[PDB]
Structure formats: C-alpha cells, structure tokens
Symmetry: C2
C-alpha cells in the first residue's frame, strides 16, 4: 500500500537524450532512429528571441552548423528541417537505443513524466499534469529546453511534450513532438497570457478514491448530490465541470471501492465548501489534481 | 525555475533489476557484477513469515532452487549465501549493464529515489526520505519486495535501501544492501512498533530557502530567534532539534539568498505557531521535509 506521485522509469528516454549546439546555444535533443528533435530556438541568440524570424535565421544555417553529441559519440548531421517549432536534424546513424515509441498530443488534464536534462545529460524525473490552460508547473532551469515529457505503455514510449519556454509568470510551455505548442504560446521572449486555469475535477475525484483504498476515509459523508448540483459548486470554486464521460472513466474505481461517483462528489462538495479543517488526505493539506483515474489504477494494481 | 520533488534518472538501476523465484515466492533482485541481491524472505511461504527460522529454511534450498530471470535471460545460480537479511546469489554471468556503484548506509533524514518493481520489471520511480524513525512512507504493493533505493553522483549509483516489509501501520521498512534493517524492524509478520517520528527540521529549512529562491517569500518576517529559543519551539511541535551542524549545511543556501539561518528559523517558528493561514508555499499547504539541503542546491543549480 501507500500512494506516491510516481514517474515512469526513465531509462528508455535517457538513451535518447543528446546535446545540440548551434553557434553559441546549447540545449537538449531527442535522438530517435536517425532523427534528432530539438526546439527550433537553438538557432537563436539571446537577442534573436525578442522577435525571431525563424525562417530567415534557419536559412543562415547549414548541416555542419549543428553539433550533436550523444555522450562522447559525436553525430554527423546530414539534413535539417523545421517542422512548426521543432528542428529535425537528420543524422547518419540510427540510435541503437531507440525504444519502441509513438508521438502523441495529450489532452489537458492528462499526466506525464518529464526527464529534466541539461547539456544532453539527465538530471531528474518527475510526474506532472498538463494544466487545463496548457501550461505545466515544472522544474526547468536555463538549458533544460528540449527536455521531453512522456508516458510508457509496456515497452512503448509515447512522447508527448518538449520543453521550450518559461513564461514571465514562472510556469512552463512547450510543444508536442511535431512542434505544435500546447496552448496559445509562441517561442518568443515576450509576455504571454496563459489565461484562467482550473482544477482538474476528475483527477481530484480519482485521488479521493486512491485515498479511500489506502484507508484515508474521514472525508466520506452521509450526503449525496447530483451532477448539476455538484457542477454549481465546481463553478464557484474554479473546478472543471464534471461530465458523464468523467463519471464513466471513474467507473472502475467506484466499483472497486463501492462508492458511487456522485456520493464521492458530495464528499468533494463538502471539502470545497468547508475546507479540510486542518486535516490531511494522503499526506496533503490540499486537494490534489495531478493523478488521473488511470494513474490511480496503475499504482494501485502494480 | 520551479521546484519539484524529483527522482534520480532510473535507467542505470533498471538495467540491474531481475526476478527471483524460490518455490512459490517471487520478488525482485538486484544484479550487480556476478551477484544477485534480494530479500531473504524469498525462501519463505506465507505461513513461514509468522516465525521463520531463516537458517533452517535456507538449508533446505540448493543453488538450483533459485530461478533468476533478467527479462528473457535466465541466469544460472552457482552459489548462495545469506548476509543478515539479504540473500546473495552468485550467478555465472556478470551483468553487462552493471553501473559504477557503491553500497551505502544512509542516515535518517536523508533522501533517495525508489525504483518500484514487480516480477523484476520496473513500474515507477519516486523520491522519498528516510524518516527519523527509520521507516519510509512509500508506495509498495505485494511483490515489490527487493525494489531498491538509491542516489546517483555523476556516474556512480549509491544503493542505500532494499524494500522488505509493510508494517501493519502501512509504513515501510527495509535494509541496506548488506541486509541490516534500518530501525528496530525484523523480517517477520508480527506487529512492530516504529516509535515516535519527528519532522526533519533542516530539510524544512532547506525547502523554505528553495521557496525564497523561487519567489514565494510571504513567510519572511521581521523577527529573529536563537538556536535555543527555536529549539524550544521545535520540541513543542515534534521537530528534530536544530544543531550547528545543520546550520553549517544550510550555509550555501543562506549565502545565495542573503537570509541568515536564524532569521529563517524565526520565520519557521512563526509558521509553526500560527500555521499557514490558508496560504501555500511551493504549492504545498504544509511544511515539507523531504528535501535535503543538497537536494535544493542540486535542483536549483541543475
């Protein structure tokens, strides 16, 4: 038993991390088969980032201007192509450590593991959620650009995130592996509105189920509610509206615990209206929304 | 910027995980050079665990009774030896994925990453602290025994923990890699007192420094205190007494932020006496004590 915010094992991604240098800028790249993927702003100086013309900047670069190093192994760049906000560097060697992989664009509220890297070298791994407003609340210092987010299903790595930017507000923005930003953000050093975020209600509910399974049950009450009644509370407290699709995804957890989804909603309603009264749930003094229903089942079923 | 509970990259440990089966019991082993390390209670049935005579139970086992599988590769066991609470199975093949490694016995209050595994297969990685009472608050289901805890320094893996037991209270106990339990615990299915735990004060202070570095500063006050005055508060709130050794280890963080350690103690004193007033620090509504000063510097310096 016990419930932890758990990242996927990072080894399959570690074998794909490389260092990419273009002129004076060095960040991280992802080496899969004979292609290295990295943020296109590797071609920018610090001053270019105010208003870069990426097409013009890239035209001044040739294959030999990109230095790619996988640990001690230097790779030979034989083609380059910009796809949205990512650069794809064709190299002459297929990465022998390429795992089975897919590129996926995840939905807001889903979770993934981030392998934070600097100079092509992994430093740590953590689990986080894509916020409803398409930011992530990560840990990214200078040089972490090109670090990637991913999920693992058996032997297949689904890459979903590449880190590009820290907003002036301190939250993080990036792209899928086709180079399309999540959210409204652009790869330019300007102030950028993220817009109102909300709490991921279906994830909070999943975590409440995780809590019941592990013996934290004090928040279970004698009340029930309706979807529409609960959603009135959700709107007041800036929670995502709960849909039947969310109720359906919570089905297995409701079955395992014998607690109907709408009963759990009435517990959550009381928690929102009355707070936690100085108590904790699974070691937290706030309502946690970075575990999906799939995360809870995964961790509880091994 | 940003601050996350970050695990070490797990790949070097993933390459060492194997499945160990003895009779009906299957758990995880650690394959380093030509030795596989695992909990000795792999030789027990469910009923043996009430009061096992490990010496007598092991005498009934020969090398061929231990089945060791590294993924699809079956290993040949050519010797076996019990060292305290671990079994050491000599195999005929050196693990070609053996990282540079050491075995270390960590001190209470230090942190490490756990690679949770089932049937020899990694499922996730998380960071935790050794509690002052030598338990850990982990995520360990049936079959996770033999999962290991570790730190990484450059290219060297320092293994510090092997998981053995879930106490009836739901917390976790295990050994160093020489098989010596942390704490008073034994590998027997009986009720076992863990004893009073306390909060790791030097870690809370480190995390407050992490918070200041990242812009959370509301808890900084106009007061200061003394070591002895603060320790009077620490004792009232079941915090570890702060020593000069702790103050010294916080030195670099004090220098970086310009906040004297005893000034930070006065902030923490006010937080203990008055609570957090419905505010949060680094996204937490409680005082976090699972980051060491070294953890904070690591994450803040990349």
């Amino acid at each position: 038993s016990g419930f932890r915010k758990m990242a996927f094992p990072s080894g399959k991604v570690e074998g794909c991390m490389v260092q990419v240098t273009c002129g004076t800028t060095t960040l991280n790249g992802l080496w899969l088969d004979d292609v290295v993927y990295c943020p296109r702003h590797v071609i920018c100086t610090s001053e270019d980032m105010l208003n870069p013309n990426y097409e013009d900047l890239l035209i001044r670069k040739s294959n030999h201007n990109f230095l790619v190093q996988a640990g001690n192994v230097q790779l030979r760049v034989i083609g380059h192509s910009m796809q949205n906000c990512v650069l794809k560097l064709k190299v002459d060697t297929a990465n022998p450590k390429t795992p089975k992989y897919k590129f996926v664009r995840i939905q807001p509220g889903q979770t993934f593991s981030v392998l934070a890297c600097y100079n092509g070298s992994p430093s740590g791994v953590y689990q986080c959620a894509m916020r409803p407003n398409f930011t992530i609340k990560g840990s990214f210092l200078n040089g972490s650009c090109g670090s990637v987010g991913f999920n693992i299903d058996y032997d297949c790595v689904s890459f979903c995130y590449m880190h590009h930017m820290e907003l002036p507000t301190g939250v993080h923005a990036g792209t899928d592996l086709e180079g399309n930003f999540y959210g409204p953000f652009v790869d330019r050093q300007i102030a950028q509105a993220a817009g109102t975020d909300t709490t991921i209600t279906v994830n909070v509910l999943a975590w409440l189920y995780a809590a019941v399974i592990n013996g934290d049950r004090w928040f279970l009450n004698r009340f029930t509610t309706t979807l529409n009644d609960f959603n009135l509370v959700a709107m007041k407290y800036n929670y995502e509206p709960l849909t039947q699709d969310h109720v359906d995804i919570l089905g297995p957890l409701s079955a395992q615990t014998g607690i109907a989804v709408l009963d759990m909603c009435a517990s959550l309603k009381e928690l929102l209206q009355n707070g936690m009264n100085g108590r904790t749930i699974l070691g937290s003094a706030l309502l946690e929304d970075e575990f999906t229903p799939f995360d809870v089942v995964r961790q509880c079923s091994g």
